[PDB]
UniProtKB/TrEMBL annotation:
Protein known as: PWWP domain-containing protein
Organism: Trypanosoma brucei brucei (strain 927/4 GUTat10.1)
Subcellular location(s) per record: Nucleus
Residues annotated as domain PWWP: 7-68
Length: 110
């Protein structure tokens, strides 16, 4: 049960004409075992700014992407110490990831 290769990972999406913004990696319905025709296999949930700018693409998004987690890749400073929206988005992503991934990884002494 590992859809979108480890579901719940926060990465960075850098558009060609657009800048680089944070986005949580989420699967539409497990596209790792079941591959059906549509056009969107990956669902990136960016921070609240454009009113749910969820980006959906199937083997089409391969431009520029960065792996975020340790918040020490010389970016957290601008994604937390710059815009309150970035700091809140990241804090929330980690607050949930460590709340759902830990709850099913030994909740209450397993």
């Amino acid at each position: 049960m590992i859809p979108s290769f480890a579901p719940g990972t926060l990465v960075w999406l850098k558009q060609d004409r657009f800048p680089w913004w944070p986005g949580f990696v989420m699967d539409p319905d497990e596209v790792r075992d079941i591959t059906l025709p549509e056009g969107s296999d990956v669902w990136v949930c960016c921070l609240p700014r454009d009113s749910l700018t969820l980006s959906a693409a199937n083997s089409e998004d391969e431009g520029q992407i960065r792996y975020f987690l340790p918040d020490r890749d010389e970016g957290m400073m601008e994604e937390g110490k710059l815009d309150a929206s970035c700091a809140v988005a990241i804090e929330e992503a980690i607050q949930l990831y460590e709340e759902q991934l830990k709850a099913q990884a030994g909740g209450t002494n397993e």
